[PDB]
Design an enzyme around this catalytic site. Structure first.
Site, short mmCIF file in Angstrom:
data_model
loop_
_atom_site.label_atom_id
_atom_site.label_comp_id
_atom_site.label_asym_id
_atom_site.label_seq_id
_atom_site.Cartn_x
_atom_site.Cartn_y
_atom_site.Cartn_z
N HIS A 3 0.85 -1.22 0.00
CA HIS A 3 0.00 0.00 0.00
C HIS A 3 0.88 1.27 0.00
O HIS A 3 0.31 2.37 -0.03
CB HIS A 3 -1.07 -0.06 1.10
CG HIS A 3 -0.60 0.19 2.49
ND1 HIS A 3 -0.93 -0.65 3.54
CD2 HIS A 3 0.14 1.20 3.01
CE1 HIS A 3 -0.41 -0.17 4.65
NE2 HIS A 3 0.26 0.96 4.36
N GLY A 9 2.38 6.24 9.52
CA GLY A 9 3.82 6.11 9.21
C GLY A 9 4.45 4.89 9.86
O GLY A 9 5.63 4.61 9.55
N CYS A 68 3.44 1.63 9.66
CA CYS A 68 3.36 0.37 8.88
C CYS A 68 4.71 0.03 8.28
O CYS A 68 5.48 0.95 7.94
CB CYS A 68 2.37 0.41 7.73
SG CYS A 68 0.76 -0.04 8.41
C1 LIG Z 1 0.02 1.49 7.83
C2 LIG Z 1 0.05 2.90 8.32
O1 LIG Z 1 1.00 3.37 8.94
N1 LIG Z 1 -1.05 3.61 7.99
C3 LIG Z 1 -2.31 2.86 7.97
C4 LIG Z 1 -2.67 2.32 6.60
N2 LIG Z 1 -2.62 3.38 5.58
C5 LIG Z 1 -3.00 2.85 4.26
C6 LIG Z 1 -4.09 1.81 4.35
C7 LIG Z 1 -3.79 0.47 4.28
C8 LIG Z 1 -4.78 -0.52 4.38
C9 LIG Z 1 -6.07 -0.16 4.60
C10 LIG Z 1 -6.43 1.20 4.71
C11 LIG Z 1 -7.77 1.59 4.95
C12 LIG Z 1 -8.11 2.89 5.07
C13 LIG Z 1 -7.14 3.89 4.93
C14 LIG Z 1 -5.83 3.56 4.71
C15 LIG Z 1 -5.43 2.20 4.59
C16 LIG Z 1 -1.28 3.96 5.55
C17 LIG Z 1 -0.93 4.57 6.89
#
Ligand SMILES: *CC(=O)N1CCN(Cc2cccc3ccccc23)CC1
Ligand SMILES: *CC(=O)N1CCN(Cc2cccc3ccccc23)CC1
Lengths: 304, 304
Positions: B41, B143, B145
């Protein structure tokens, strides 16, 4: 989101841990520059522990009687001195992995990470607080002393704790890195009781702020209270007295949640007077007092 | 003595953490040998997140669009592939700090250490369990992940978790290091509810053994029970069913405390039916299920 009892990364401190043997006693030492710090009770036989004269015991000891091992390589000891309750062994090699560091003596209520070690090898890491009674609630087996407590400010490691003692009540006493005990404790096998273990009120309030930020808000009420009024209820429940300093220190958490400190005090009062009624706050069934306001800000803002 | 939620030393994993940027999205990657693993992602705009076609999104991306930074030095990306929900970025430099490692897919109930990172920089470390509903109860901000879960067997790091998701209920979903999600979770911004979060019965029993070893024995009773009888009470309270395997896994703890597993089951039944009555066990007001029997043995024996 989510809120967890978080230790600092232990990497910088792993690179400082050595084994120290004096005769049949092995414990951990901290290797910074060309000095190894360890508990002075390394020079004792358990017989010595009943009434050790550390000065007289240390006269029998020479540089070559202090066996220092960093990983599987022996360090050569070229000097040895007693500073309060720690030994400083001068080695001929500076620790190449010496991070930027300070020795700080912490205040009760302040939190630090412990890297539990055996034979100069790290086994694990946990977050502690210095209790108001100058004890810590550690996890320390035989061989674990010389294990250290620390904070990291970006790249500087502030060493605050070296482990020395278990009290017959299974809590832990130790020194700053200048070898002075937190509390009235002495490195001797004598009757020593911890005093009243009071709750760090400002830390509970911080953790209530952390709960609110993380969506757990059931304990929020319609009430407020006063410092004097709140402190009457604190007294009854062996909570530390709350001061304007504490209230000032919570300001940022106040600002971010838009809950006045005294309103949260009123929430805390109701929790003390009424209990949790089988509910939980950040997955805890009691009031957590081992997060500082600084800890909450850090964890709820992502400081590295 | 004393018993604490202990993470592994994080040193070996700190040396593996890099920053990964694709356009305006920065998260963490894991650098092992000449491969950087990160959540796929990273290639998404939050608009993409509603219904991303990762294959089509990835066609628009070239090696040079993956900015990888280890400390303050840029790594050159010479290859990129999608494996399930992770990207593997091939770099021209092997991580000189690559420890001995394995990728293991863990079972629910099993525990691991998390090194929470932001922009490839470690902020802290905590102990987790894979919940029976394949969620973890983390502390993860934007940030975070690409932050990983691990176990260490002496010098080998087994990577079990990479962080990917927060569920609208503020629990955490992620992948093994082959990019397969634990549980039914997908890396998409869709309705996704965690299932029933059941209690890891074998872990509670382990932690009751740990309590007994550490002198907290008030909850010990005169009673025993049977697997079938105990499991009727487990069911009612959303505890995992206890099996002969679980009982076998507790054997060593049984042996060391000389308390039969089924007698401790009977203690646990009374705790479930009667609650704690305002008392605590190892400083907890509820039953801890995020220590394994293996965790208890380790911490109550000092394994490094
Ligand atoms: C992973 C992290 O640090 N954050 C959370 C996830 N986001 C992107 C992401 C990934 C999977 C599902 C999802 C659903 C709604 C919004 C964002 C999403 C990046 C930042
Ligand atoms: C520090 C450690 O790992 N152990 C506990 C302390 N022990 C020596 C020692 C030090 C201070 C007081 C005291 C009292 C009774 C017995 C032993 C004592 C070394 C092992």
């Amino acid at each position: 989101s989510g809120f967890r009892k978080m230790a600092f990364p232990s990497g910088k401190v792993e690179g400082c841990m050595v084994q120290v043997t004096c005769g049949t006693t092995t414990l951990n030492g901290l290797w910074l520059d060309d000095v190894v710090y360890c508990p002075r009770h390394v020079i004792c036989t358990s017989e010595d522990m009943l009434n050790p004269n550390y000065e007289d015991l240390l006269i029998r000891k020479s540089n070559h009687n202090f066996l220092v091992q960093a990983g599987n390589v022996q360090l050569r000891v070229i000097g040895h001195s007693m500073q309060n309750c720690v030994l400083k062994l001068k080695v001929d090699t500076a620790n190449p992995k010496t991070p930027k560091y300070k020795f700080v003596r912490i205040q009760p209520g302040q939190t630090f990470s412990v890297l539990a070690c055996y034979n100069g090898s790290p086994s694990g890491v946990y977050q502690c607080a210095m209790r108001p009674n100058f004890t810590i609630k550690g996890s320390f087996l035989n061989g674990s002393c010389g294990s250290v407590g620390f904070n990291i400010d970006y790249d500087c490691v502030s060493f605050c704790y070296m482990h020395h003692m278990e009290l017959p009540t299974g809590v832990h006493a130790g020194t700053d890195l200048e070898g002075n005990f937190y509390g009235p404790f002495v490195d001797r096998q004598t009757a020593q009781a911890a005093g009243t273990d009071t709750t760090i009120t400002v830390n509970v309030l911080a953790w209530l702020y952390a709960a609110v930020i993380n969506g757990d808000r059931w304990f929020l009420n319609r009430f407020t209270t006063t410092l004097n009024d709140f402190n009457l209820v604190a007294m009854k429940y062996n909570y530390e007295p709350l001061t304007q300093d504490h209230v000032d220190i919570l300001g940022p958490l106040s600002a971010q949640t838009g809950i006045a400190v005294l309103d949260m005090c009123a929430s805390l009062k109701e929790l003390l007077q009424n209990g949790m009624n089988g509910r939980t706050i950040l997955g805890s069934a009691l009031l957590e007092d081992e997060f500082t306001p600084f800890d909450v800000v850090r964890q709820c803002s992502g400081v590295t």
